[PDB]
Design an enzyme around this catalytic site. Structure first.
Site, PDB file in Angstrom:
ATOM      1  N   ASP D  67       0.825  -1.201   0.000  1.00 43.08           N
ATOM      2  CA  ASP D  67       0.000   0.000   0.000  1.00 43.08           C
ATOM      3  C   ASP D  67       0.859   1.251   0.000  1.00 43.08           C
ATOM      4  O   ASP D  67       1.761   1.396   0.823  1.00 43.08           O
ATOM      5  CB  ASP D  67      -0.934  -0.001   1.203  1.00 43.08           C
ATOM      6  CG  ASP D  67      -2.137   0.897   1.010  1.00 43.08           C
ATOM      7  OD1 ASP D  67      -2.310   1.461  -0.095  1.00 43.08           O
ATOM      8  OD2 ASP D  67      -2.922   1.036   1.975  1.00 43.08           O
ATOM      9  N   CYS D  99      -7.311  -4.867  -5.937  1.00 50.32           N
ATOM     10  CA  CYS D  99      -6.949  -4.582  -4.566  1.00 50.32           C
ATOM     11  C   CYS D  99      -8.081  -3.804  -3.875  1.00 50.32           C
ATOM     12  O   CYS D  99      -9.195  -3.719  -4.401  1.00 50.32           O
ATOM     13  CB  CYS D  99      -5.645  -3.795  -4.566  1.00 50.32           C
ATOM     14  SG  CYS D  99      -5.064  -3.337  -2.931  1.00 50.32           S
ATOM     15  N   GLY D 102     -10.142  -0.624  -4.696  1.00 53.00           N
ATOM     16  CA  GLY D 102     -10.025  -0.519  -6.140  1.00 53.00           C
ATOM     17  C   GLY D 102      -9.908   0.908  -6.638  1.00 53.00           C
ATOM     18  O   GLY D 102     -10.124   1.177  -7.821  1.00 53.00           O
TER      19      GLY D 102
END
EC number: 3.1.3.48
Lengths: 149, 135, 137, 152
Positions: D67, D99, D102
């Site tokens: 992330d 992910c 989104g």
């Protein structure tokens, strides 16, 4: 739920009738507005003594459904107001008929006109306060009503 | 558009009689409706005296069986009267000036040599008014 | 002119219940004492809203025995409706008319963070409020 | 957001999704099958058994990055090679990504493809946010502007 009508030195409650169940809260509601006199025109059903004990002079002055006031009832009505506003400056006169929109306000409108309100204006004032007021019959009597007094 | 189109007429309203007992099966019947606001009539349906809110019922249990007519004397909810011909925006003011989001619906009556009266027509709630505003 | 943000109820001030609520007397009493038509259901952070409790949901319970919340929300599986903080009032008004429902939950996006963006949930707005803000004054 | 987003552009076609549970696995797979995806790329939430997806024809690739982190060049290279073949070898078809919700590194990867297919960088970014409000933070915008295409 009841209606005040002020005009100048004059002061009027239009009310609903109580039960005996509601009588206390009715009398307290009258006392809140500071009334000296009820007129019953209709729904002449309940014990008047508990109201008269609290100070409030009750007159059964009955006349007819959908009718203008009989002349004699007029004169008693007129005289009642004339003293009671002069004798107790400030105070209120209570009336009820059956939903407070026929003959009860007729008596009020009567008074207004006698106090030199124009017919139409008296009428509109009441209808502003309580919509639906007067049938055609009573409106006419109002129109035809010439004050003296 | 007046109240009249948005009005629920009286026959189709859920209401309760003034000497309702709130037992199990009554309290359920109140709940299974799911109005927030339930009117209280005596004994002619057009004659409406008081007004059950929901949060009223929260603070009863069906012990013993508990009278409806007491509960309504308790909080003493005012009931709100509207005319039939009140246009929808004008009605919406009255809900905003009130606490209440239901009014009972009065039509006048000069038909008859009698005194006038208000006829009672039925009921109109906030939800209905908005549900019309969208349409 | 005015966005949802202005008509919004902020999140702390929303009546919500957690997803493993048990519906005994006193919770049911609190629900009625709220008198919301539409009570949202979180897990276990508040900002995280999973399902929507309508009132007529509880109608087909009795507080026997104590019957749990998360069941009831599975039952009808009520859809829940998202609107963005910056959506204008007339536009959100359109979404409600496309809806059956008259209540939205309100996200803004979150750009602070080195992370991926996410939808911050800000709170609630009802159709009622939106109209109640186009009386305007 | 559980509703997934198609992004079409020429012979390229992209589903951005949420990850399922196993409780949702069938309906997830059926949903992918609906859009006619041949390949999932899982970037995050690689949480669930992938064989029930691959058994239904859909190749599942765990290409995780972190992330905030940009796509690692090898992921960029693999993604780009995946699409270049997969759009030629089966014309029509979709690639799925997920992910987390989104709007971060998954639509980055979509954007990256678009730019390589000769979209202006700025135009790609909007085209995405069009279909997915809130896509890209600052850092990824910096990445995307700084990305120079050549290829396929």
């Amino acid at each position: 739920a009841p209606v005040e009508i002020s005009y100048e030195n004059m002061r009027f409650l239009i009310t609903h009738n109580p039960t005996n169940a509601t009588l206390n809260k009715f009398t307290e509601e009258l006392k809140k507005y500071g009334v000296t006199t009820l007129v019953r025109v209709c729904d002449a059903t309940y014990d008047k003594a508990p109201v008269e004990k609290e100070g409030i002079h009750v007159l059964d002055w009955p006349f007819d459904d959908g009718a203008p006031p009989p002349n004699q009832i007029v004169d008693d009505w007129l005289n009642l107001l004339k003293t009671k506003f002069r004798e107790e400056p400030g105070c209120c006169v209570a009336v009820h008929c059956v939903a407070g929109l026929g003959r009860a306000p007729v008596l009020v409108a009567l008074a207004l006109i006698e106090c030199g309100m124009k017919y139409e204006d008296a009428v509109q004032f009441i209808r502003q306060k309580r919509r639906g007021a007067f049938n055609s019959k009573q409106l006419l009597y109002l129109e035809k009503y010439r004050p003296k007094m | 558009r007046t109240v009249e189109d948005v009005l629920t007429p009286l026959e189709d309203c859920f209401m309760l009689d003034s000497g309702t007992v709130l037992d199990f099966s009554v309290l359920a019947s109140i709940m299974q409706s799911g109005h927030t606001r339930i009117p209280v009539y005596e004994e002619e349906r057009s004659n409406i005296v008081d007004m059950l809110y929901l949060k009223d019922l929260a603070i009863v249990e069906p012990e013993d069986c508990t009278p409806l007519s007491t509960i309504t004397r308790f909080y003493n909810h005012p009931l709100h009267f509207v005319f039939n011909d009140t246009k929808l925006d004008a009605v919406l003011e009255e809900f905003k000036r009130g606490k209440s989001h239901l009014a009972i619906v009065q039509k006048v009556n000069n038909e008859g040599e009698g005194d006038p009266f208000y006829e009672v027509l039925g009921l109109v709630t906030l939800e209905d008014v908005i549900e019309e505003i969208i349409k």
